[PDB]
Symmetry: D2
Subunit: 292 residues, 4 copies
């Protein structure tokens, strides 16, 4: 009965997407993408972006760890675990053939796998970042900092795809039918937003409904909820193990320039996204397992 | 009341899309795109591609002209005329303010214009090609070939975007309301196919539904049907003025490897697509005037 | 025996290249590239950009004309004339067989032509811009702006290559012998700088060694000097026919924030690049006819 | 005083570069790049590619292992080991200060690092592949295949740079000084060819002049020599642990269609490249530490 609570969330989330970002924000957005080695700024960071002096300083405190061999391996090990959990817990009778029947060519199915690959690789990095932000605020604690194995502090595996931004069907791009797929997900996952993951799948409307439609019955089953706690506890372990110490408390929030009250709302906001992220990692894993 | 007849189109169309093309075909596809200087193979040429040795040979007979200063200016003057025609015959309200209110940012509206630019540039080039193919078959005639102004034989203005293929929501990609928006168009336009320019617009569903919604009432008004005659007449004039003579008769079809039967079917296919291309040139013009 | 008088420029040129440009200036560079529809910022515009508030202002005033059918055709008509001129004045030996025998493959020779095309397309546009800036300052006149044919004000031929920036071997990149070919070019062309064109061709040092060596004997022959004057005059004529009036005189330069002392230097600097731009249009034409 | 014996190479090496590779071979070249996740076909694979039916068959059999977490981790640990090794064996002064003073902007130095990054990531993967071909042929043995940890069989970390092909100044591109730096490199490393990485560094000839000059004294110091053997041993150990069994014996090479004469020749060619990739791994590690 291992299970992860969806927090209270009073808070209005105010993402700054990349197509609206001003030049100052877009610089941090670029540093973020380059450092992780991902071609998309996640909604979580679009949302912490609203509290921009916090985001700026938090990222600055976190960026050194993100650049390390340790952080590459820690994220990669969360992807592997998800691949392990979902393969053991759920039946994946594939869908390459289902897609062929629908009309999809081998080229197209390639392009889809390539999109799911991006998020497969990128989400454990956002999860760990989310975790550090939320736990730093909540506990005021200093995390990581140990020397240990010197190879842990080495530069991460260096190749990366950072351009272009994946094609994403935003919520105001959406027509009616797709809007209902988008409402169906928000409700099912209990989120006020559509993940970048689904939006990029949505470029292929008929493909997204098929995939989501196979994933939906697995959400909040006990094995899913167990698996999600597991993924969550591993991001908590990566937080404890950062190569460069990370502290960003409520008081560092004030010093960064936020009111006490804005810090309270930020905590609700990051707690929501942090809870979202262990779930999307199972979610993306599922889509990718079907795709093979 | 000048009108140009929608022909009979008994014939099944069988386009080989780029994501399906094999190595041999993809190579002619690359030469096509490179010469015209467009990043997409048009449905017209996808469809004539089914009759591959005719398509191969016809393209060979036409490409010398396509590479010329003459052909660049003839295509460009067709765009200019359509801009001229639609600007006068139609009151087209600006509508970027609507898009803004729907939630589209200044950057997104930019990307949308960039897509319309592609087709605004490329469709006169496909229109003239489809005209050469059609009339060569019907009349057996040898068109152009005059020396004239030596500058007409000069290399065309050199710059092109060749990549990537635009993002198109193909018909099997399409979801619910979009399959009915696609249906709406097929019917209104009397076509069995959805054009590439709509599919590219389809990446922004909400933007398609009401760009199209604004254009639909214009189709087959007298000023529309007349503007279309004008565009069709000008492609016939560019056909007569080709700097390298083009002949591809019915008997060349047979020589190419086609049967009498297949050639009969090809004539129906090219006539339908040829008819389509003057309509789509006004259509794209309309979209693009809306988007100022 | 006709020729373009080389101006005297004692003035130091201080180009801001794209790889040192700050955010604000990159934003203007970007807009310049998107409107011209070329992938590179000219050394001409890099040197004017030093006197930044004047550059910013000459560009806002000129850009309305740059976006027009008139400006696209006028620039393109200068490319045609240079092709005509060099073709009739010079017997140019083909060099692709000699490239082949040096080791160059078909694709490579193709890459070489593609780069040449970029400058064959772009440079007349810079020539006209430079002419406008120079004459506006020398004469104080308002140029163009007559109503005339409505089509001249239409949007220009709409698709372009903006990315990536051409691979250019800068002077501080060059090793010994490439620094000697750069020295040669400078003295023969009478310039204190290396054009973007040669640096781009310099990606293939041996090809540049060849194409420059075949061009050089033709430099400042009578047929060159007369053709150059004619190219020049075409730019001056392009100036009087601009769709949207352009005035940027000394009084305007002062108002933009320049001193008296900086305006005299700017007049010198633009004067030297203006003279230059007639020569580079012919030079790449020779290049490009060598490579047929 | 440990050292890797250089093998006698009598054989003429005959690489098909990406810019000459035909359609069939380019499609093998593609798959190799999309599996390794690098944007370049290595010269080792270019030379084995001459023996094309053997090349196709050795890659079909090795590709199952290359697609695995094991292979990703194992290649990555070779990168980690060389960093560790050159770091504790050598005190390497920074060079970015001299690059600055030479004229290199912050972005250019950034670009150079990004190119170094590529090889830093890819080369271990080419080391291991080359090791499998050499040992397979020399010993007739089946390599890897034991079940072990299930995770080893999982899909590798799923993101890559596959385009564009790095800018590489080939030997028929090079001019005067470059040819002599290339000459220096060949004799110093005892190779009758230039590696992809020096030709890439060569886009910036003065950078290559500087980075190679700082390396060359270190070449064949005891420390270098001893470290190179270690890297070589770990490749040999990666070979015994391949997730999916690999056999490609001389007998196998006969079935693929090689004579006995070509197989002797192929054994000499792969042997010389096999020896070489242990060195290039240390070599670029050095450049990269020079450039921190």
């Amino acid at each position: 009965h291992l299970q992860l609570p969806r927090p209270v969330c009073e808070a209005i989330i105010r993402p700054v997407p990349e197509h609206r970002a001003d030049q100052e924000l877009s610089e941090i957005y670029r540093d973020l993408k380059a450092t992780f080695g991902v071609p998309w700024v996640g909604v979580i960071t679009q949302a912490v972006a609203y509290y921009r002096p916090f985001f700026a300083e938090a990222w600055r405190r976190f960026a050194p760890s993100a650049k390390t061999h340790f952080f590459e391996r820690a994220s990669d090990d969360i992807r592997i675990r998800s691949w392990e959990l979902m393969g053991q817990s759920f039946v994946i009778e594939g869908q390459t053939d289902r897609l062929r029947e629908m009309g999809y060519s081998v080229r197209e199915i390639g392009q889809i796998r390539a999109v799911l690959d991006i998020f497969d690789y990128g989400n454990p990095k956002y999860l760990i970042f989310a975790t550090a932000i939320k736990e730093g605020l909540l506990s005021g604690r200093t995390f990581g900092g140990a020397a240990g194995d010197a190879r842990c502090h080495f530069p991460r595996s260096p190749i990366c795809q950072i351009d272009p931004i994946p094609v994403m069907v935003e919520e105001h791009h959406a027509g009616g039918t797709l809007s209902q797929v988008y409402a169906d997900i928000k409700q099912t996952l209990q989120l006020p937003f559509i993940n970048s993951d689904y939006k990029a799948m949505a470029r292929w409307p008929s493909y997204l409904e098929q995939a989501w439609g196979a994933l939906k019955p697995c959400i909040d089953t006990p094995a899913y909820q167990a698996g999600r706690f597991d993924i969550n506890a591993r991001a908590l372990a990566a937080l404890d193990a950062l190569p460069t110490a990370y502290r960003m408390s409520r008081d560092d929030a004030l010093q960064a320039g936020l009111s006490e009250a804005q810090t309270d709302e930020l905590i609700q906001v990051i707690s929501l996204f942090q809870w979202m992220l262990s779930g999307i990692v199972l979610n993306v894993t599922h889509f990718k397992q079907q795709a093979l």
